[model samples]
Target chain A: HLLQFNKMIKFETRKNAIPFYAFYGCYCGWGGRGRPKDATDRCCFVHDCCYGKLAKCNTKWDIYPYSLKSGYITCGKGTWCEEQICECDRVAAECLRRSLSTYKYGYMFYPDSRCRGPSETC
Target chain B: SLLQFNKMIKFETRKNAVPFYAFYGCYCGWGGQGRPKDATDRCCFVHDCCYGKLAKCNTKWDIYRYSLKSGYITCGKGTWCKEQICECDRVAAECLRRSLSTYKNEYMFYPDSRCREPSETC
Candidate 1:
């Protein structure tokens, strides 16, 4: 059953256009001000890392994969996104949402000001 | 009136612990895949920049200040945050919220998974 679930996850992940790497996570210490403590404080490389010293959590840039899919989100319409299922769109949305809310005036709200993904909207 | 509004903004921004730099903005192109487009695509150095080459928009890294106070947020209670006004708390909330929603799987969900600021909760 677990194997099937895993396969289904991969299938869903791929169908939703989610990146395999998206399942991976990275550390984003204090949004570049200090060190991160929990998930809220953590960020993936693409989400908040890779920008260099400018990141608010300008401390570590460690990224890795995980075993469980703890996060969740509502996928877009006409796409492979399924309700109650976490996918790439959700990942993109969550990441962008945090960035927007946390930084507020400090964050850049261009292109997807509402925090929508390439095809979805928030 | 404009000057007063500017002064008020400065006062409010400062009161809410909003960094002077928060009013500034930086470029975050394609979330580290390419160049950024509008506000949604744009990210501040602190919010998504300074992490180095790992950024999805891994192309340009530019930071700058702006003239208008266009962003908005909802401040917390017992704090200096004013609902009609955009303050640090609100900024923090908005920034964090966006990040959480955008990169659901890719982002780290810790201390403030709800995307709440130091004194606020989403």
Candidate 2:
């Protein structure tokens, strides 16, 4: 049986819906200040090796797919998500709910907040 | 004696104001072709934590708390078993078991078909 629960998009900016940059999560360290002001320069490419600077981008540009069934926002246009799940990392996307970093849909109640933090109200 | 009696009255006045849906879990009787629903399945929360023998699965849904207290399902319309646990029958508990199982293993690859209806935002 498949398990899906507490899955959500994480916004890491000062504004609402201002999507941020993301990485493949080989190490559990999620760090990056997102893209710079240049809107046109917003794009990222993944490779077999880890990114040099955690790959910069923003959510306004495109959505990324973490698994074959999860669609998330990003700075660089995402290739992983199509309908809902990620293409390249379906397992990671699917298992995200059990991960410590998952944010649920109902969590949107907290407008400008960090993704994984001590805030339980979200 | 009077102070203690008054405190008891206050406690009774502040009784539970909503219906609660609690859960335990199981993974029997459901399987796919050749896949008899393996073990190492999911961690089920039975909430019989008198000895830490079982985990507690506590979740709140979109119930108009008052609607449930008015007498409909559980307390009226939802459920109440032990520790105010909802009285879920065996078969009814099975569905709760599946849903709870999903919450426990979020990465077990459940299909998006499990996604609840848009009208019913869980």
Candidate 3:
């Protein structure tokens, strides 16, 4: 479920028929298509790419669940895949915070059909 | 959020125990936090590291919380990884129960002995 797009299980839409490095800018999945909104949204694009790049490593980057009581993630560093999964999250979390817009941390968590980013297409 | 501890008196135990330190001391999971004030606390330090090693299992990465539904608390398992996590807690609990010395204080974790450089705020 790395690059799931508008469809329940798709990395493609009319825009990404065959996909390209699984880099669909603004969103990680579920519509949020086209370019990313801002640098904050761009961070999601990078985070998406990171997940897609490592998707086949027997790990799945789950959406930030509403029910996740403990918001922190403690990486196990056990399996090779597990460490990378943690790595992706580490970078993503850092990027969001560094964006300097604390409340926008959950920007990409909620997808939007309006795409925006530095990339050509979403 | 249930940290309604008697901050004034207890805070000194920590403030009095100024600069509480340790490399592998008590922590929820990953990086070290809290100091090993005594053998019992040292046991907790070991426990934290033990849980840290159990990333492949789901228990270690979670923050400390024990309730009817918490996997770490109940020690429920469906695989070898889960089994190891259970053992990790098992050994730590036994260590805490048997410990009866001082270099620290008493049984059960105390607020004063908690770490300084703690995990991520969010």
Candidate 4:
């Protein structure tokens, strides 16, 4: 299973149809600041790992495409890769949804606008 | 409210997974030569029928090149499950897409037995 995973990476990247690193996951940066600023972003980090880094999780298991609407994205379909990909999104989205309460001073939604301080911790 | 939200996301994520065609993997079958055909096995069956594209399969034809601004771009279509722009991918992604046709837009939100442990109970 692991070996085939490597093969998928090689073939997909080599073919240039998709960039392998693109699927390496956002590392929770889907929050868009190049780094996670809160627990919600952390969920996205773990989500990336689940897509490929975790190994135990998979991507090809998905029955639906996490479509970007041809807006530019990457994915591995019809393989265990897709399974883990979908699974990761589910867990991450769940985690983010649950962690919304943890948002401090709106830092999660607007990192550039907020500061970490006692008011937020309160 | 948090608890209620959790139920909605968790349940919704799994339902869309449908787990009928993923075969719990992109590879065909669990062991040496699949025949008994478990639920996931059926997915592998379709993938194989699409021409043994279980892992690192090739495209009928696609070429990609790197540019300074875009990094990687596809000359054929684009990359991603929905953007494969090829035959096998069209069929396989279509299969994956239809895995939750019954739910239209919300099935993949619900997790099922097929969902991984993290999101399975969360």
Every candidate's lDDT: 0.27, 0.23, 0.40, 0.34
Location of the lowest summed lDDT over 10 successive residues in candidate 3 chain A: A4-13
Model 3 TM-score, all chains together: 0.37
Residue A1 of model 2 has an lDDT of 7
lDDT-wise, the better of 2 and 4 is 4
The CAPRI class of candidate 3 is: incorrect
- Residue-level lDDT tens digits of model 4 in A1-122: 23223223222222211232222222333322244555755564565556547465434332323221122122334344444554455454446556656734334234332422332210
**Best candidate per lDDT, number?**
3
Worst 10 residues of 3 chain B by lDDT: B1-10
If you score just chain A, what TM-score does every candidate get? 0.20, 0.19, 0.50, 0.40
In model 2 chain A, the worst 10-residue window by lDDT is A40-49
> Taking the tens digit of each residue's C-alpha lDDT, what string does model 2 give over B16-121?
1111121112211111111112221221122111112212422321111111233223222433222232322221233333444333343243322332223111
Residue A27, candidate 3: how far off, in angstroms?
A: 2.0
Residues A1-122 of candidate 1 have per-residue lDDT tens digits of 11212222332333211232223222222223323222332433333433333334212211111112223322212111121122332343455445433432212212222323332111
Each candidate's DockQ: 0.01, 0.01, 0.02, 0.04
| Runs off by more than 4 Å, candidate 2 | A1-21, A24-29, A34-122, B1-73, B77-94, B98-107, B111-122
Per-candidate clashes come to 88, 34, 7, 32
- Report the C-alpha displacement of residue B23, candidate 4, in angstroms: 24
